From a paper:
Globulins belong to cupin superfamily and are categorized as 11–12S legumin and 7–8S vicilin based on its sedimentation coefficients. In this study, we have structurally and functionally characterized a 52 kDa protein from the seeds of Mc. The crystal structure of Momordica charantia 7S (Mc7S) globulin showed maximum homology to 7S vicilins.
The crystal structure of protein was determined at a final resolution of 3.1 Å. The monomer of Mc7S comprises of two cupin fold polypeptide chain separated by a pseudo-dyad axis of symmetry as observed in the other 7S family members. The trimer was observed when the three monomer molecules were arranged in the form of an equilateral triangle where their extended α-helix regions interact with the other monomer in a head-to-tail fashion. The structural analysis led to the identification of a bound copper and acetate ion in the protein. The Fo-Fc map showed the clear electron density near the tyrosine (Tyr49) from the N-terminal domain and the cysteine (Cys321), and two histidines (His323 and His355) from the C-terminal domain. The copper ion is placed slightly away from the centre of the trigonal plane formed by SG of Cys321, ND1 of His323, and the NE2 of His374. The metal possesses a trigonal planar geometry with copper in the centre as inferred from CheckMyMetal server.
Author numbering:
A (entry chain A), B (entry chain A), C (entry chain A): 46 to 124, 128 to 214, 220 to 225, 248 to 324, 333 to 428
Write the structure that this text describes.
C-alpha cells in the first residue's frame, strides 16, 4: 500500500567485502508502474572502511556524487590527458561524466558513506562497472588476448602475465561543497541546502539537482510540492515520518503515510504535496537528488510565505469557507516559514 | 481504416457538471501503434458555462493553452512568491508550467471553450489533477492528518474541520494573443496564425507550437506537409474534409480520407502530405498544437510558391513527364499560394 | 554469442533494381536487448550504378550522410523557398533534416556507395520514404483524388492523368567534407578523421558524430573506449578483426571476439573497451556514425598518451603489481600512440 518507500534491505547488493560495501537500489520499474519517468535513474550507495582504496573504473552512466559520512580523497581522469583530484568531507557534491575514470581513497579512521545518482547512458535504466582488477573474468586488461595485450603495451606476454594478473574496494569545475553553501530554507526547526542545474552548468548534463535537508527534533517541513523535479531522498541519520497525498493510489487522493527509518529512500514525484516530521526523539537528515529539476519551483501550502497569500481574496472566498480578509487569519497564522514545530503522538 | 481521427465522443470525460465540462482525449497508444512519438502528449478540452469559477490547482504536466470560444480571466501563481493574471478572449495562447498553480473565471454570458495540450512530466503519457476542494477523498488539505494540518497552519483542528471541509468547476511573459498575431498564410481562401518555439522562448520548454487555421467556404489548403512537427488539430467551428497520404496504412501509400465534423481531432505526423477542404456550406476553423516543432518547415506541393519551383528542370524532366520549361506550366499554374478554391461533390 | 556484429545479408532490403540498391539494417531491438538506447537509430546504405538518378523525396526522420565510394551530386530543397546543391566525393558528410526533400545524381562511371544514419522523428525507431513516382499506390501526387489534384494544381484532370502518371532509383552550411579534414589520430599505422557536434552545430540536431578510420596492414587501434558515444561502424573496404570486453555477455567481463568482413556493421557502446586489428593481408577502413556523442571522450588503455600515465604512482602500485616509477616502464613502453603494429596468427 506504499510504493514510494524502499528499505535498507531492498538494495540490490554488489560487493559486500570487509573493506567496503557498494550496492545499487533496483530500478523503479520492478515493483511499481507509477514510477516510470525516472526509470533511467538508479540510486546507489558506497561504504568503505577506514584505510581503504577503490580501483580506477568507469561506468557507462552519469554519476552525481554526494558524500554522507566521513572523508575520502577523490580522483578523476580522462583523455592529451588531464587529472583532477579533490577533498571530500561530509556534504560534498561531484558530477562524474560517463566513461570518465575515477578512483578514491578513504584515509580516515571512521567509515565513509557516499550516495550516487546514476543515469545509464547506454541501455536505459541499465548501467555497469568497468574495472581494472579481479576474477578470472574480471579485468579489462586480464581479459584480452595476450597477443593483443602484448602488441598494444609493447611488452613481453609472460611479463604481462605477472602484472595485470598477480573486486573494486581493497585495503589502501567539478566538485562543489554542498554543505558549505547557503541554505534556501533555514529558520530554527531545520535547514536545507540545495545545488541546482540553473545555477550549476555541470548539473545541466545529468539533468538533476542535489540537496541536503535537516529537520530538528519534533520539527516539520510543511505541506508543499515540487513543480517539475521528482526527488529521491535517502535517510542519512535519525528517524521520522511523512505524509504525501497520492492521486494514483479517479482523481480521488488517498493519503500515503509512513515512517522514515535510517537507510531508506523515499520518492516524491513532481507536484506531489508532502509534509515531513522529524520525530519525537532525534533529528532527521535527508540527503538526495531530484530528477528533472530545471527552473523547478517548490510551492508551499502553509507557512508565512506560501502560495495562498499571493492569491486574490475572491478566489479564497469562493474556494474555501473564509472571508475577504479573514483568509489572512488562516494562512498568515504560521509565524514561521518552511520548517516549523510539528505534531505529537 | 482511419486511425488519425477521433470523434467528440472518444474523449475520456473528467467532470460533466452543470457549470462546466473538463475532458481529456485518451492517449495515442490505446487504439493505434503508428502514433508513439507523441504518446507523452494528451489533448484536453474545457467548457465553463457563464458565471463560472475553476479551483486553484496544478498538474504534474506541462500545459499549452489555447482559447477557442468566449472569454475568461486567467490566473497563475508559484513560489518569495509571484502572481500573474491575464485577459483571455478567443484565440489566446498561454504556456502553463507544471506544478504552477492556476485558477480562472468565466465571467461572461456565453460559453467558454479552451483547448489544452498537456505533456505529463511524471509518468510518460500520464498526468493528473491536484486540487483544493471536493470529495471525502478530494482535497490536498482535507486529506492529511488533522495533527499535521493543525501543526502546519498554526490553527485549532476543529477550526480546520470547518474551513477546508465545509470537483473543480463551480459557480462564481506567459500569455500571447494568438489571433492578434500576423498570419503566415492569408490570401483570400483562408488565414493561418502560428506561434512557434523558434520565436517564443516559453514554447521551447513544452517543445510544441500553437496554431489557428481558417479555410473559407469551399476553400482548400493545398497538399503539403510538416518537416518535423506532428500536428494535432481540433475542429473549432464548421465542417469539412481531408485527404492525407499514409505509408503505414511496404512503402506503398494508401490514401486516408475523411470528413471533419465539429469537435474532432486529426493527427498529422511529420512529413505527412495533407490537403484540406473547407466544405460546400460553411467555413472551417482548425485550432491546435504541433508536437516537436522547432525549425519545423512546412513544404507545399502546389501553389505558386512551393518546393517544385525551386528545383532544376532536369530533375523535373527525369522525374515526371514534363519538359525543361514546360514544367513551369504545371507548377506555376495555381495563381494563389497556400489556400485556394477547392473541389466539389 | 556475438550480438554486436551484423553481416552484409542482415540488411533489410528496400529496392534491388539494376540502377541501384537502397537497403536499411533492421533496428537494434529485433535480435538483442542489450542495444536499446540506440533503437531510434537505423543504419542504412545506398548504391547507385553509373548514370543514375534518385527521385525527390523525404523521410520522417533525420539523416546523416557519409559517402563511401565514388561520386554523386546532391540536392536539397525546403520551404519562400531555397535550393542547396553540392559535390560529393569519397568521404563527404551531410546533415539532412527530416521533411527536407532531396534528390541526387550519380554521374560517374563507377559505383556510388553512401552510408546514412537515420533517426525516425515520428515513430521511434521507425521511419519511412515519401516519394514522387511509382506504383498504382506509390506517388504522393498519383494517390490523391483527381478532384483535389485538379483543384490544387489548377490544371485539367485528364492532363494530370498524363503527367504524374505516365521506385526511387532510376537511370539519369550543410555538407562538410570529412576526409578533407584533419585526423585526430594519425602516426603511421593508421589515420582517423572525425566531425563532432561540439564543433559542428548541424550535428547538434541529429545528436550524433561522424568518422572515418583507416588501419594499415597488420595495424592495430589499441584497447580504448568511448566516454558517452555508442558507435556504429561499417566496413568500407578490406578485412580485419576485433576484441571488445562485454560485461553483459554479474560484472564478470567475457571477451567478445570476431572478424570484420566487408559490408559489416559493428556496434561499440559507450565505455566499451575495444581493440582493433587490420589483418595480415590488406588494410582496413571503417566508416561510421557515433550515437549520443557530445563532449564524448575517447580514453586509451595503452600507447604513449593514455589514461594510466596521468595517474599517481600510488594508485598504480595498489592497483596492479608495479612500483612507484616502474609503472612508467609498463605504460610508456608503447612508443606510438593510438594506432600501432598489431598481433599475428
Ligand atoms: Cu502519486
Ligand atoms: Cu502515415
Ligand atoms: Cu557490453
Amino acid at each position: 500500500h506504499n510504493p514510494y518507500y524502499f528499505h535498507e534491505h531492498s538494495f540490490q547488493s554488489r560487493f559486500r567485502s570487509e573493506d567496503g560495501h557498494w550496492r545499487v537500489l533496483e530500478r523503479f520499474s520492478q515493483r511499481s508502474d507509477v514510477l516510470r519517468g525516472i526509470e533511467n535513474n538508479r540510486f546507489a550507495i558506497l561504504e568503505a572502511r577506514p584505510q581503504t582504496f577503490i580501483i580506477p573504473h568507469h561506468l557507462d552512466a552519469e554519476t552525481v556524487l554526494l558524500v554522507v559520512r566521513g572523508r575520502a580523497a577523490i580522483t578523476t581522469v580522462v583523455q592529451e590527458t588531464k587529472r583532477e583530484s579533490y577533498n571530500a568531507e561530509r556534504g560534498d557534491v561531484m558530477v562524474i561524466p560517463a566513461g570518465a575514470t575515477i578512483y578514491l581513497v578513504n584515509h580516515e579512521n571512521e567509515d565513509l558513506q557516499i550516495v550516487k545518482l546514476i543515469q545509464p547512458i547506454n541501455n536505459p535504466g541499465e548501467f555497469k562497472d568497468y574495472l581494472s582488477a579481479g576474477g578470472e573474468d574480471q579485468s579489462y586488461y586480464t581479459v584480452f588476448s595476450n597477443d593483443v595485450l602484448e602488441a598494444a603495451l609493447d611488452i613481453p606476454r609472460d611479463r604481462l602475465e605477472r602484472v595485470f594478473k598477480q573486486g573494486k574496494i581493497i585495503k589502501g569545475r567539478a566538485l562543489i561543497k554542498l554543505e558549505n553553501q547557503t541554505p534556501v530554507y533555514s529558520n530554527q526547526y531545520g535547514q536545507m541546502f540545495e545545488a541546482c542545474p540553473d545555477e550549476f552548468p555541470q548539473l545541466q548534463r545529468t539533468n538533476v539537482a542535489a540537496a541536503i535537508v535537516d529537520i530538528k527534533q519534533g520539527g516539520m517541513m510543511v505541506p508543499h510540492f515540487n513543480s517539475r523535479a521528482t526527488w529521491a531522498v535517502f535517510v542519512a541519520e535519525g528517524a521520522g515520518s511523512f505524509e504525501m497525498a497520492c492521486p494514483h493510489l479517479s482523481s480521488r487522493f488517498e493519503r500515503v503515510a509512513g515512517h522514515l527509518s535510517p537507510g531508506g529512500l523515499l520518492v516524491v514525484p513532481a507536484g506531489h504535496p508532502i509534509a515531513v516530521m522529524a520525530s519525537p526523539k532525534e533529528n532527521l537528515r535527508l540527503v538526495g537528488f531530484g530528477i528533472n529539476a530545471q527552473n523547478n519551483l517548490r510551492n508551499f501550502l502553509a507557512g508565512k510565505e506560501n502560495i495562498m497569500n499571493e492569491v486574490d481574496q475572491e478566489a479564497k472566498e469562493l474556494t474555501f469557507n473564509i472571508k475577504g480578509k479573514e483568509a489572512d487569519e488562516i494562512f498568515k497564522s504560521q509565524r514561521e516559514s518552511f520548517f516549523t514545530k510539528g505534531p505529537v503522538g
